[PDB]
């Protein structure tokens, strides 16, 4: 029906008609109608553009005719339109407006077919397009260059530069460097403010090509000269300029930062060698120092990434450092004055200059901090005298009041804390003594809740970053702890939270010092701490009280003598054990207390207190656990009746009520306490003899018999740690666990991939450890349940959730490993008959699934082991498996010919020992197979590049560890 085209032009739904044909019926038309159509569209576009009024007030229709033309080139060009570019050039010299619109065409075309993607052009497919279509990237360049030499129109030149940028990566590099285009860009087009932005982007892009030495210097020289001349001198206050600039000028300053950093990262060594370009070198860095003062996240990160490169290089190569000494001096100041907030600092300034407890934990910020800390640490090693001097003289100006402000004391505190590990122990000692004296003196000077909160957070930050100093100076340690206790009485919850966090952080390093009796002291500080605990912690929220008891438990586990450690534990637990004996009394007399918010809250917080101490004490917590254990399990049973009663009485809807939520929190914390102890228990035979049976008895039937919405995923998690630590010697216990949680949980999660997301995760963690530690339990299952196990396994690795998929694959691998192990036994024959093919097809399906971007390597390994399971067995039915696989491949890839299927099948089964080679075979074929079709292929290479990055990070970390201060104390063990 399309035929009525050429006339309507030579229009809203008229161009829409061609669009439906080009996208759905184009490759059907003979070469006849295709030459005709492409010609009358290039024709009528040209007509519109030669008329000025149509050109001016109509760019909207010229736009979608360009989009139409692009859709044509995508299909026709180059193989069936070998002379499009000549027809482009030809028609361009005939009219200025045609030429400009032709530039827009070039741009849109590259946006559609060339720079659809760009960065990952480091590969064979784009390298194909580049040097095979070289002849007409040569033409596109030549057109752009000729237009730039004799072009007049601002909008034309802009359009030309926009397409240039789009094409720079395609053009034989010869043409960028032997032409005078680089001189042209870096002078005339930097001078003109209309062309400036795009020219800078172009030149940035040039610093990213595959590489002349003289020209790269030259264009940088020109560009810097033209900025100084036409835009702003190196001395300009860019922080101010930026703050007051419009959108265009801000964008320009960002582009300048990008240009300088990218050029200098690549070409710095060039400029360092010739001691004639030193000024230009320092000048470009001086510009970046100015840019680095701008208050804008992305501009700041852009500069910082570059400084990190520079100063890491100078530290490893110190003979270069003299060159940049003044630049590094300015940079210390910029960084010290513009520190990102460490994650340890829990109070913040909002919109209305209110000091609050941050809600949000931004980890975009955590990476910015990490990079800034490293820059400051490298700068500190480069000049530790300058660094210390800056920080101490800045602190003096906080103290004399001349530069006092929240912002200034914060950034400086954060910098001081961020360089812990950079100094010798001696230099650090003198440094930290002064800083702490000054920050304490600020806590006395600066009154009001706000002041107090700001300065408290800074002093807590600093002391928590210098445990090495505290460990060596018992007097400062005690004083610092007493001050933290004082902070725990402040009304600001952010300050309290940080006081408990800092207490914990220092105790992790200094615990020994709290347990021994110090000279000058009547008793170990842990004794004093415990006796005053009720006073010390009276203002804390329960969550902070739990941290405080956690820190005490870390100190108590330093006492290696049993009677004394047990008595410290008993003393620590006096308050929660008193509350526990009371509430156990009261609640068992009147079980409806369990529906009371306050009572539930009391119980939950007792259990949480025990979890917190157990987390720190591990195996040493047993006397306390054994003190509450039976009443705790009775409480669990009692709370479980309450919950079932509300469900029976109200509906399912009961689980949404606060009463039932409150009741389940008790069950969840009890399961956490027991999981936590069993995960660290040393006495495993006692765990089995005394703890396990009452635990399974209290928890398993209750889980099995509850309604789905009232089953706690925490039961699965507790059972995973039980099986993991003692599963090897509770075979009956593991069978009960399976019997109680297996079918009923599988029923909850086998309808979709999303409902009961924690049950899903904890279910496959539990199956993986059962399959591993007590595989015999899966044989005590009736065959109907084994069948369910096999389906559940496949179901798991069908998820896109990594935290389920990885376990499904592991369990499939452990199961096949097992079946491989038993050889020619009845069960293996059953497995082949009933389950082996399910695993083969389900594995191959997820492995080929383009939507399933996770897990390639392990899936390939499982397919390898399945294939090995048959072809490595001399008496198995091998040709049957080859026929099955030929059918499966034919079905997955219907477009392959029989010989292509043959060749894939044969390469697939040729070897099944070396995973690296197998993976490569599979990838080679799947990439070829999915090229024809356009399906995605990177998922195939993603596990590898994620593994190379992790290796890269582990190497960096190992180097960083040798440089004092790069890793913070908390990251050191310890």
From Swiss-Prot:
<feature type="domain" description="Importin N-terminal">
    <location>
        <begin position="1"/>
        <end position="47"/>
    </location>
</feature>
<dbReference type="InterPro" id="IPR041235">
    <property type="entry name" value="Exp1_repeat_2"/>
</dbReference>
<dbReference type="GO" id="GO:0006611">
    <property type="term" value="P:protein export from nucleus"/>
</dbReference>
<dbReference type="GO" id="GO:0006406">
    <property type="term" value="P:mRNA export from nucleus"/>
</dbReference>
<dbReference type="GO" id="GO:0005737">
    <property type="term" value="C:cytoplasm"/>
</dbReference>
<comment type="function">
    <text>Receptor for the leucine-rich nuclear export signal (NES).</text>
</comment>
<dbReference type="Pfam" id="PF18787">
    <property type="entry name" value="CRM1_repeat_3"/>
</dbReference>
<dbReference type="InterPro" id="IPR011989">
    <property type="entry name" value="ARM-like"/>
</dbReference>
<keyword id="KW-0963">Cytoplasm</keyword>
<keyword id="KW-0539">Nucleus</keyword>
<dbReference type="GO" id="GO:0051168">
    <property type="term" value="P:nuclear export"/>
</dbReference>
<dbReference type="InterPro" id="IPR045065">
    <property type="entry name" value="XPO1/5"/>
</dbReference>
<keyword id="KW-0597">Phosphoprotein</keyword>
<dbReference type="GO" id="GO:0030621">
    <property type="term" value="F:U4 snRNA binding"/>
</dbReference>
<dbReference type="InterPro" id="IPR040485">
    <property type="entry name" value="XPO1_repeat_3"/>
</dbReference>
<dbReference type="InterPro" id="IPR013598">
    <property type="entry name" value="Exportin-1/Importin-b-like"/>
</dbReference>
<dbReference type="GO" id="GO:0030620">
    <property type="term" value="F:U2 snRNA binding"/>
</dbReference>
<dbReference type="GO" id="GO:0030619">
    <property type="term" value="F:U1 snRNA binding"/>
</dbReference>
<keyword id="KW-0653">Protein transport</keyword>
<dbReference type="Pfam" id="PF08389">
    <property type="entry name" value="Xpo1"/>
</dbReference>
<dbReference type="GO" id="GO:0005049">
    <property type="term" value="F:nuclear export signal receptor activity"/>
</dbReference>
<dbReference type="GO" id="GO:0030623">
    <property type="term" value="F:U5 snRNA binding"/>
</dbReference>
<keyword id="KW-0813">Transport</keyword>
<dbReference type="Pfam" id="PF18784">
    <property type="entry name" value="CRM1_repeat_2"/>
</dbReference>
<comment type="similarity">
    <text>Belongs to the exportin family.</text>
</comment>
<dbReference type="Pfam" id="PF08767">
    <property type="entry name" value="CRM1_C"/>
</dbReference>
<dbReference type="Pfam" id="PF18777">
    <property type="entry name" value="CRM1_repeat"/>
</dbReference>
<dbReference type="GO" id="GO:0000056">
    <property type="term" value="P:ribosomal small subunit export from nucleus"/>
</dbReference>
<dbReference type="GO" id="GO:0034501">
    <property type="term" value="P:protein localization to kinetochore"/>
</dbReference>
<dbReference type="GO" id="GO:0005816">
    <property type="term" value="C:spindle pole body"/>
</dbReference>
<dbReference type="Pfam" id="PF03810">
    <property type="entry name" value="IBN_N"/>
</dbReference>
<dbReference type="GO" id="GO:0071528">
    <property type="term" value="P:tRNA re-export from nucleus"/>
</dbReference>
<dbReference type="GO" id="GO:0005634">
    <property type="term" value="C:nucleus"/>
</dbReference>
<dbReference type="GO" id="GO:0006409">
    <property type="term" value="P:tRNA export from nucleus"/>
</dbReference>
<dbReference type="GO" id="GO:0031267">
    <property type="term" value="F:small GTPase binding"/>
</dbReference>
<dbReference type="GO" id="GO:0000776">
    <property type="term" value="C:kinetochore"/>
</dbReference>
<dbReference type="InterPro" id="IPR014877">
    <property type="entry name" value="XPO1_C_dom"/>
</dbReference>
<dbReference type="GO" id="GO:0061608">
    <property type="term" value="F:nuclear import signal receptor activity"/>
</dbReference>
<dbReference type="GO" id="GO:0017070">
    <property type="term" value="F:U6 snRNA binding"/>
</dbReference>
<dbReference type="InterPro" id="IPR001494">
    <property type="entry name" value="Importin-beta_N"/>
</dbReference>
<protein>
    <recommendedName>
        <fullName>Exportin-1</fullName>
    </recommendedName>
</protein>
<dbReference type="InterPro" id="IPR041123">
    <property type="entry name" value="CRM1_repeat"/>
</dbReference>
